[PDB]
Structures are given as structure tokens and as C-alpha cells.
Amino acid sequence: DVFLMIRRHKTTIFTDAKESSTVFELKRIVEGILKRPPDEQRLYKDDQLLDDGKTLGECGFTSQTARPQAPATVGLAFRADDTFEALCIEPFSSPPELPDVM
Amino acid sequence: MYVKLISSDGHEFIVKREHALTSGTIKAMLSETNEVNFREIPSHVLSKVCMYFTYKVRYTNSSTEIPEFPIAPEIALELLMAANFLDC
Amino acid sequence: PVLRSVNSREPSQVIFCNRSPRVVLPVWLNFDGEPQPYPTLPPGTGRRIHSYRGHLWLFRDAGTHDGLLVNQTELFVPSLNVDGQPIFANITLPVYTLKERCLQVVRSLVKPENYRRLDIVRSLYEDLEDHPNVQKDLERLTQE
């Protein structure tokens, strides 16, 4: 099994899958939460793009890299009005500087 | 059944209700619909809390070897304050 | 006392198996109920040790004294062997609360003399200064 964060702008989804799970199957559950069609979904692996037929293991996602305590990030973009959006994942807030006592 | 947790900087985290109810504080807040807004918890901290919920539910009552839960030094204090407020 | 080994003199063979990322400190409660430290086990190692039936064992992190689980519980008492098969004491990391895990990490990064220079509530200073120790947990176990 694999654990991933499906990120899209300021939207992050925590869910679990398997190395054998295919990209299209992941788009199925994305519709289960975001209620959007797989036709208008574009998954990414570090701005590499993912094919609907390939598996997570083939895309580089592995159980040792997709942990419950450290899920693997997957890009997402949606096709609005028959035009796919460009990858835009909002970065999380940066932590503050480390106090001298650390 | 999913629940959305929203941080102070606007980031939205959608997690299973089971995982969210790990926190006693969130359970009382949950009972908008299936939405909770945290005013003091930034995104980089709330993201790590959701990882704990996934880690907690995963390895609780399991015979699989339990790995260490990682906490970077930068986010240690903020996670502690969020954890103390969330009771998780 | 109550939590104390029994001088049974009945040999029992045990394999301490450290299935945790921590350096494990085996602690033997002697017949007076007083913890007695034993040699440590590096992470991912196992040793065949000689103990006796009715003897109480608990397991801790050698460096921080964080509590560890053995066979999914906290206290391990060897039982008489069967078919020449050893008793496995599987030492494992607990699923700590997020708060306790947070305190562990902070304690390792800040010297104890500098806990109160951190930007946190005063209640957390006491929590940080409340280091895990064996005597603390024996009190909980005795009363239950």
C-alpha cells in the first residue's frame, strides 16, 4: 500500500492506494472527494505528468517513498471549459527560524 | 466520509472523518458542515498533523513493525502547541 | 511491594528482539521491586538471554528512557518453555500521542536548562521538564 497527498492549489487530500493501483483508478477516488470527472484530471509526478494506464510503481511511487507518516505528493490540475489547467500547487507556509536554544 | 480541515493561511486539508476524530478537540468541533477552521495552526503544521492521523490509524492495533514518526526541528515547537491544543 | 519478580528458580529462555529504531534498555525489577538496568540492545538486534519464571521485565529507550512495548504490552514476565522453543520478547515502538512525540523531539534539541526560553505556554514547560522515568510508570502499573 502507498499513502499520498493529492494536491491542487490550496487543496490537499490524504488517501491510501497501492503500487499496483493505476492512474485512472486514482482519478476515480479523486472524483469521490472533489466530485470531478477523470476526463478533466491531470495527475503529475514532479511536473512529469502521469499516464492513465501506468501504475504507481511504474510512475516512481513506492511503499518506501509513500509512507503513512510521510506521504508522497502528487500534482493535480483540472480541465475547465475543455482547457487543462497548468500545474499550480500552493506551497505550504515556511517554518520560522530555529531558536538559538536549538 | 471525509472532513475538511482548513489552516490559518487558507490551505485546505481533506481527511477521513475516522482519522480526524483521533483528536478529541476536533471531535467536539465537528459535533460549516464537515468543515473546521483553525486560526492558530499554519499549513505546514496542519499538514503534519494529518500525517499523524494517518500514521496513528495505520499502526494502531497492528502487528506490523511501528516506525518512528518524523518531526523536523523547524516544526517541532509549532506541532507541540498544535498537539497540546488538539489533544491527539 | 506488588510489581516485583518472584524468586522461582525455574529457568526460562527468552530472546529479547529489538524491533524498534531505538536503543533498548532492558530493566529487571528485582525481588524488592526496584528496577535494575541490564545491558542495552542496539536497534534491529536480538539476544538469547537467561531469565526465570515470574520475573518482571520492562523496556525503555536507553538514552531518553521513553517507554517501549514488549509483546504489545508494557510488562513482560517469562513463562516456562515448551518443546525447547524460546519465549520471544518483541520490543516495539509504541504509537505515541503526537504531543508525547513532540515533547521527545524538543527534549532532544534543547538543553533542559533552556526549556523556559521557548515561545510556548507555561504548562508545556512542566510537560517538557516531566521526563519519562521507570519509577513514574511503575506507580501507574501498581495501582491498576
UniProtKB/Swiss-Prot annotation, chain A:
Residues 1-65 form the Ubiquitin-like domain. It is found in: Nucleus. SMART domains: UBQ. Pfam families: ubiquitin (PF00240). GO terms for biological process: positive regulation of proteasomal ubiquitin-dependent protein catabolic process; protein ubiquitination; protein-containing complex assembly; target-directed miRNA degradation; transcription elongation by RNA polymerase II; transcription initiation at RNA polymerase II promoter. One of its GO terms (molecular function) is ubiquitin protein ligase binding. Its main location: nucleus. Keywords: Acetylation, Host-virus interaction, Nucleus, Phosphoprotein, Transcription, Transcription regulation, Ubl conjugation pathway. Pathway: Protein modification; protein ubiquitination. GO terms for cellular component: Cul2-RING ubiquitin ligase complex; Cul5-RING ubiquitin ligase complex; cytosol; elongin complex; nucleoplasm; VCB complex. The modification Phosphothreonine is found at T83. Gene3D superfamilies: Phosphatidylinositol 3-kinase Catalytic Subunit, Chain A, domain 1. InterPro entries: ELOB, Ubiquitin-like_dom, Ubiquitin-like_domsf. PANTHER family: ELONGIN B, TRANSCRIPTION ELONGATION FACTOR B POLYPEPTIDE 2. SIII, also known as elongin, is a general transcription elongation factor that increases the RNA polymerase II transcription elongation past template-encoded arresting sites. Subunit A is transcriptionally active and its transcription activity is strongly enhanced by binding to the dimeric complex of the SIII regulatory subunits B and C (elongin BC complex). Core component of multiple cullin-2 and cullin-5-RING E3 ubiquitin-protein ligase complexes (ECS complexes), which mediate the ubiquitination of target proteins. By binding to BC-box motifs it seems to link target recruitment subunits, like VHL and members of the SOCS box family, to Cullin/RBX1 modules that activate E2 ubiquitination enzymes. Component the von Hippel-Lindau ubiquitination complex CBC(VHL). Belongs to the Elongin B family. This is Elongin-B. It comes from Homo sapiens (Human). The gene is ELOB.
Swiss-Prot record, chain B:
Its main location: nucleus. SMART domains: Skp1. Pfam families: Skp1_POZ (PF03931). Pathway: Protein modification; protein ubiquitination. GO terms for cellular component: Cul2-RING ubiquitin ligase complex; Cul5-RING ubiquitin ligase complex; cytosol; elongin complex; nucleoplasm. Keywords: Host-virus interaction, Nucleus, Transcription, Transcription regulation, Ubl conjugation, Ubl conjugation pathway. SUPFAM superfamilies: POZ domain (SSF54695). Overexpressed in prostate cancer cell line PC-3 and breast cancer cell line SK-BR-3. CDD domains: BTB_POZ_EloC. It is found in: Nucleus. Ubiquitinated by the DCX(AMBRA1) complex, leading to its degradation by the proteasome. Belongs to the SKP1 family. Heterotrimer of an A (ELOA, ELOA2 or ELOA3P), ELOB and ELOC subunit. The elongin BC complex interacts with EPOP; leading to recruit the elongin BC complex to Polycomb group (PcG) target genes, thereby restricting excessive activity of the PRC2/EED-EZH2 complex. (Microbial infection) Interacts with HIV-1 Vif; forming an active cullin-5-RING E3 ubiquitin-protein ligase complex (ECS complex). This is Elongin-C. It comes from Homo sapiens. The gene is ELOC.
Curated annotation (Swiss-Prot), chain C:
Changing S8W: In PCC and VHLD; type II. Changing R101P: In PCC and VHLD; type I. Changing V110D: In VHLD; type II. Changing V95M: In VHLD; with RCC. Disulfide bonds: none annotated. Changing L29P: In VHLD; type I. Changing L128P: In VHLD; type I-II. Residues 97-106 are annotated as: Interaction with Elongin BC complex. Changing L103P: In RCC; with paraneoplastic erythrocytosis; inhibits binding to HIF1AN. Changing N18S: In VHLD; type I. It is linked to Pheochromocytoma: A catecholamine-producing tumor of chromaffin tissue of the adrenal medulla or sympathetic paraganglia. The cardinal symptom, reflecting the increased secretion of epinephrine and norepinephrine, is hypertension, which may be persistent or intermittent. This is von Hippel-Lindau disease tumor suppressor. It comes from Homo sapiens.
